[PDB]
Amino acid sequence: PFVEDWDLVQTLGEGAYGEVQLAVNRVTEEAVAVKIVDMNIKKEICILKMLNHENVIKFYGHRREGNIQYLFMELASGGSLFDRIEPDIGMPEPDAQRFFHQLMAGVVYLHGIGITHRDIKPHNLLLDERDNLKIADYSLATVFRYNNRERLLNKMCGTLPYVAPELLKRREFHAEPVDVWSCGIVLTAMLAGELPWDQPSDSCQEYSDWKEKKTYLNPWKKIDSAPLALLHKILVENPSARITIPDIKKDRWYNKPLK
Ligand SMILES: Nc1ncnc2[nH]cnc12
Numbered sequence: 001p002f003v004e005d006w007d008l009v010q011t012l013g014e015g016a017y018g019e020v021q022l023a024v025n026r027v028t029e030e031a032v033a034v035k036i037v038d039m040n041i042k043k044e045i046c047i048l049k050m051l052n053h054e055n056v057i058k059f060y061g062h063r064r065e066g067n068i069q070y071l072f073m074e075l076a077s078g079g080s081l082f083d084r085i086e087p088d089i090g091m092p093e094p095d096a097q098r099f100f101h102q103l104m105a106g107v108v109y110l111h112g113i114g115i116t117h118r119d120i121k122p123h124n125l126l127l128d129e130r131d132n133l134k135i136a137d138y139s140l141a142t143v144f145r146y147n148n149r150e151r152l153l154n155k156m157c158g159t160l161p162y163v164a165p166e167l168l169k170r171r172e173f174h175a176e177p178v179d180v181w182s183c184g185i186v187l188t189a190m191l192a193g194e195l196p197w198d199q200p201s202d203s204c205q206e207y208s209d210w211k212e213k214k215t216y217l218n219p220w221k222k223i224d225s226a227p228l229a230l231l232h233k234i235l236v237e238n239p240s241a242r243i244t245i246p247d248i249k250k251d252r253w254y255n256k257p258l259k
């Protein structure tokens with residue numbers, strides 16, 4: 001299979017929203033990623049064209065060919081953060097910190113252009129050949145600030161183990177604290193190789209245990225006290241008391257020099 005000058009050479013992803021292909025230009029040998037949708041997409045493309053940052057997947061352009069749309073994007077040949085997390089272990093704290101720094105730089109960037117991602121998780125955090133983190137997949141992304149005016153969200157979306165509790169409990173909620181929460185669950189996964197709860201509900205025992213500060217349980221007992229103090233500020237049930245990214249950047253562990 002092929003599109004104009006490009007050959008589609010191998011599958012990088014095959015989900016609900018189409019397939020992602022490695023695309024190699026037959027002439028130039030340039031490798032890119034191509035998202036293939038058999039036709040919502042108007043919006044995603046509008047958002048993709050806004051994106052210009054070292055920790056966000058760049059958009060190159062699109063081609064309609066009948067019922068098939070082709071979205072051309074920066075390739076991340078390093079795979080996903082998901083593949084760097086050892087189950088039950090996590091990864092070395094200095095690698096976690098570096099990835100967390102890059103993830104915060106990407107999320108500040110998106111929030112600064114009034115975009116919320118809404119599905120931050122290790123599968124959506126891709127690595128380039130230098131292990132640089134790229135926030136990918138803008139199929140659920142939306143505008144939360146336009147003409148300097150914030151709009152609250154009401155659509156429930158994301159992935160239950162990563163979603164903030166307000167998204168299950170409130171009719172409308174602020175976008176930014178939901179993305180901050182999901183970054184906290186990503187940091188837990190990196191440092192513990194395990195997700196803390198199926199979902200942040202009153203009916204979820206592991207969530208109740210965290211609210212009662214039972215940090216002698218897993219996954220918290222595998223996490224050093226410094227990163228764990230940051231996770232205490234991020235995974236705060238009240239989204240107005242939750243730490244903001246400006247304040248994450250003043251955290252002791254965030255600024256701790258590591259191996
Ligand atoms: N799934 C993916 N794999 C590699 N690079 C990509 N760029 C966008 N999506 C990608």
Ligand SMILES: [Cl-]
Nearest residue numbers: 189193194195
């Ligand atoms: Cl995990």
